[PDB]
Write a protein that binds this DNA or RNA. Sequence first.
RNA 1: CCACACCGUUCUAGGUGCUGG
Length: 148
Amino acid sequence: QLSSNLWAAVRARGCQFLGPAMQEEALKLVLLALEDGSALSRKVLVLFVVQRLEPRFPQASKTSIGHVVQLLYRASCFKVTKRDEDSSLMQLKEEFRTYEALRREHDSQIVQIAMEAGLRIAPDQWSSLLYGDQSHKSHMQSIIDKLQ
RNA sequence: CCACACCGUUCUAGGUGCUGG
């Protein structure tokens, strides 16, 4: 029940959480594409991630991965180079080119959406929802403290 | 509402499907 309201608010903003293991791998594949400073269109980044993710996770799609990318878009993780007529190119901002930096920004964004939706979720519940364990308790509390 | 897909959102944001369930 505590999942349902959170994931509905996440999806209402064009975002998605695919699950602890799947979201982690998805974000690490974004790093594989963008850690070296490559400027990829949204289409190409999504095509890059989906290909590498669907062997481990068959349900991965252009649509569901696009929703993960949007979460990082909303969290301001990209340098966006707009172009006339054509589609924009996206690079990872230099400060989010490691997993823990990107993941902090990603997690913070989900917590912001939860706060904007009027939901109250404790750090232990957050650790379960985002990591499938209770070993990220202080990590989530730290994120909540900075948002408040 | 869900899925799929397209266009847009870094001036921050969602839209469109005369796609499917």
